[PDB]
Homo-oligomer: A and B are copies of this chain.
Amino acid sequence: TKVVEISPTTRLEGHSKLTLKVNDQGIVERGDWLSITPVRGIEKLAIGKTMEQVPKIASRVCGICPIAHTLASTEAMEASIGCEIPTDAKLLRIILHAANRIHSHALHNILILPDFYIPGTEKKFNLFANEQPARSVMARIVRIREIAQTIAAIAGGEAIHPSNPRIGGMYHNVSPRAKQKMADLAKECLVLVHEQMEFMLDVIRNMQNREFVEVGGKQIPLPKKLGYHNQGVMATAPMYGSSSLDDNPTWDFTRWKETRPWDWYMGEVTIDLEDPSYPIGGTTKVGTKANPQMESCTGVPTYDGQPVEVGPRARLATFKNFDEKGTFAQHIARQMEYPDCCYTILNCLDNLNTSGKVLADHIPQGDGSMGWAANEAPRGSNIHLARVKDGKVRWYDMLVPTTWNFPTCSRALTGAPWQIAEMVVRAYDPCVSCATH
């Protein structure tokens, strides 16, 4: 057993690090992936603020997935106070939600491809570079994200930190022209995401057929069960979500308990293995002390007393019984979600009545009852819980998808060459600002 540490991680959102115990062959025996993002404390600063403000602050948790926190937070206030929003507000929120899933998955394509090979070769994708095919692939991705962000701004008021959601519905319905325009963009987008989906699935299939990859000069063997774990999965919807206002909620708050990293992470250790050649700047100097129990910046939520995986594979396993697991399975599941996003948008536009009401006639002020809302954010189940009384937030809690994935990914690190530990991590599409909030 030796101790190697990668810090910081790269090609993910936010600031984390990997603290790995390895055997004499350099395979992980027990690795801890933990956040080291400073804790802004959204849930604690929320207390005493108005129910209108708290969702706009929580949105600023993360700029890749602001839709998820705006919606989960707003609908937790609606659930605590017993507010039923109009049908045309729900339709605009679903359009906003699906558009944002398209842009997030596409962004993640940018972050993972540098680890993938142009199929049948030993050249890795470089997207920066003004060469083919990398450059025409970047162009497709850029137009997908652009369509996605435009639809989001139209139905949501803003692509990053949507302004249109409010307690009781939306500020604005959209004009007949706006609806035509979102339809036109989603028609163009459906063709593109099918192309991109097929492209990415082929690249992943080629990776599943490799025996090694190249990391800073060396060949690194590619294990067959790369990134396997036994934690299972948790998901609340294939697309949108669920709240405590529902006749049959698809999440059970009685099965949840958040603990401290204390119960699941490693205690103090000292780094006795180092590699200055790891691209690009090497690992932690030998002799450095590390304590994942105390350096980890997140809490550990559990379901039936155990950490779980959330995200696109969690969703397909829960709702279609998708039966592959691990790193490449996670990549596959995520790409398969591309078309649903655009079919949803088009179905929703078709039912939207641009003359319809978007604000509930009555907004109650709340009596201190607990409500919750789950949003199936691009990376997994995003659950906000709230007690609102007299229009003020008296209690608030956020169980964010990457928070769920931290201890579960850590366990998935067993059996991997420490040089591709980051590849196991990237399959989760991590957002460390989200996880920490």
The residues of A with any CB-CB pair to B shorter than 8 Å are 190, 194, 230-234, 238-239, 248, 255, 257, 259, 263, 302-306, 308, 316-325, 332-333, 336-344, 347
Contacts and interface: CB of A to CB of B under 8 A. Distances in A.
Nearest to A315: B304
Contacts of A233: 320-321
Given A230-B324, A304-B320, A317-B323, 16 more contacts: A230-B322, A231-B320, A232-B319, A232-B322, A233-B320, A233-B321, A234-B320, A239-B255, A248-B248, A257-B347, A259-B343, A263-B339, A303-B320, A305-B342, A306-B340, A321-B321
Nearest to A255: B238
Contacts of A255: 238-239, 319
Contacts of A238: 255, 304
Contacts of A333: 230
Contact of A232 (B239, B263, B320): B320
20 contacts: A190-B263, A194-B263, A230-B333, A232-B319, A232-B321, A232-B322, A233-B321, A238-B255, A239-B304, A263-B339, A303-B320, A304-B320, A304-B340, A305-B339, A305-B341, A305-B342, A305-B343, A306-B320, A306-B339, A323-B325
A339 B263 CA distance: 10
Nearest to A235: B321
Contacts of A319: 232, 255, 304
A231 B338 CA distance: 14
A230 B306 contact: no
Contacts of A323: 232, 317, 323, 325
- Of all A-B residue pairs in the complex, the 9 with the closest CB atoms, nearest first, are A232-B320, A305-B340, A305-B339, A238-B304, A317-B321, A232-B322, A257-B343, A233-B321, A304-B340
A336 to B, nearest CB: 6
A333 to B, nearest CB: 8
A341 B302 CA distance: 13
Nearest to A248: B248
A343 B256 CA distance: 10
Contacts of A303: 320
B234 A305 contact: no
Contacts of A306: 320, 336, 339-340
A230 B336 contact: yes
Given A321-B232, A321-B318, A323-B323, A302 B343 contact: yes
